[PDB]
């Protein structure tokens, strides 16, 4: 257009379907390979990204260019990686993911904010569309453009070690939260196409349903098994939302590591392209899980080159290696050179990536933007994140008898109080999973506020504040306590060993509430990603909430126990008498809960 050296597909003004085929139509295959190629930051170089061609990088579950790095150290982290992308001879930016599924929670003080059982239980999607919008700023404060969420599971039973990530055992539930969607990506035009990406620009992600299908539904709920269910099952509680997604313009979707009546998501030609791609429309790009291509063989990894083939015949689009990289590009190589795949497939997974890349406007910002740095922890979004933990908690007792007076909420003035349990001055426990390590961790892992700290905020002056982790019954009587507040639950996890049968709480957990119960009226805070066994805890309790997996905002807690606000939170999920009932969910064969799901006692704020 007007230029001697022109060339389409660097033309900003040119729509998407002709600078994707513009580019498609120079590549050689080794950059149509590498465009399919997804490696991780640990195993990149300017050289490795420039050589092969790579299409995409990850930071996986706490990889971070160091512990404590600031918003503009993760800035040129990516930015020297794109810089090496955009050298190559076509310059094809790179797309930078990360899971960012409760904030930007692998970076030292990004907002944290309640897992999806929380954000489940507040029934509001408009505060969870809010929580997009703000987790997509913080995303980009750190120069990354894609975010590995939302989790659309439909968390059919607790001892998934995964179920903190479901919003819901009801598909309803979940349907309504795919607003984050157009939180992280922006709201789709009037008169958008369901099943086509959607990125609004440099201030938004690429978000990515995942994982796809049935992951929730695991049997015993045991982590990457089988799903075993029939069609009219698997697409009337764990296919719903996918379609919400399209709707909302989902930029990509990850498959499961899970398989479906014994086949390997990873291989499931029907469901990757006879039903998302063919049948729902889905235009994105579609990725494996991580190493999720080795698993599809047992033992994983033992046919590599049976890896490939099947999951790039299945339909997916680009590979999360993630080290590897070498060894997936040659193989890849070696099978369309004998035309084991044709080139038909790589075309079409090469579209979707690229249609993905220039539709959210990769190509003309490739760089971080310096001035979003300031977005990451901003304190409007930690107000949101105390609005969310707040409007997430479930009131489940509130007085042992019909006749007592109500414990909650609590004055702010008392001559003295005590705070106490494991869980009430341990942000990394709050927080859990996906909290700056993988695994979360212990202790004072990133900026918020304790539960500790949010009482000490919320006070009158003349209160005094006590705090014993595990104080004895003794200790307890001859304090002079008004009240107590204990805190205790579940230590942080993930897939890889939150898989438990048992679901009861770590000790000393049950015998610091029992102590102090003993000793003084209390409210427990119960710290879980699900419910766990409760009638030990209810007995002891005047009062007792279901805090879930906060985040990194404590006050919201407090905002709640001292009666700012009143409780609204309501179960999102099943509570279970005993763990031999389980698999149980609503509208099931002799459903028998403890609180059915819905239940939630209610407050006046004061
Ligand atoms: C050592 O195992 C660790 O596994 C985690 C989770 S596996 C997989 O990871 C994807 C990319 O982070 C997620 O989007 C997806 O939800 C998960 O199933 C991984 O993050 C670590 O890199 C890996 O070390
Ligand atoms: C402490 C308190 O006022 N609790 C009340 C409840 O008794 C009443 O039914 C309702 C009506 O607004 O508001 C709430």
Known sequence: ???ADYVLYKDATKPVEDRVADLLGRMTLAEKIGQMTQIERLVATPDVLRDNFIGSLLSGGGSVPRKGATAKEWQDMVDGFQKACMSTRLGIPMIYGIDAVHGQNNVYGATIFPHNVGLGATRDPYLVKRIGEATALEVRATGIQYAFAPCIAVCRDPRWGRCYESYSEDRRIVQSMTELIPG??????????????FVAGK???AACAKHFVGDGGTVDGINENNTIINREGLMNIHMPAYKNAMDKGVSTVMISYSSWNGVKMHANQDLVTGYLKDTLKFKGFV????????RITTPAGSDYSYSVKASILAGLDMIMVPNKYQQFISILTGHVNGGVIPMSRIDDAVTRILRVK???GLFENPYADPAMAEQL???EHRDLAREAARKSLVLLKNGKTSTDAPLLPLPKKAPKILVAGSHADNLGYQCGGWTIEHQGDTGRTTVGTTILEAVKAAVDPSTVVVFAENPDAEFVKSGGFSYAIVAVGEHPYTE????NLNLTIPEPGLSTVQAVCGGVRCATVLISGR???????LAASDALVAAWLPGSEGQGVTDALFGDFGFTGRLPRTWFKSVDQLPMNVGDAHYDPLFRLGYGLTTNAT
């Open 1 to 3: 257009h007007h230029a």
């Open 184 to 197: 992280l990506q922006g709201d789709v035009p009037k008169d958008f196409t369901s099943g086509m990406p």
């Open 203 to 205: 201030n938004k992600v």
């Open 287 to 294: 990725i494996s899980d991580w190493e999720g291509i080795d």
């Open 358 to 360: 220039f539709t959210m």
């Open 377 to 379: 922890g901003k304190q």
């Open 496 to 499: 890889t060993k939150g898989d």
């Open 531 to 537: 419910p766990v066994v409760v009638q030990p805890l």
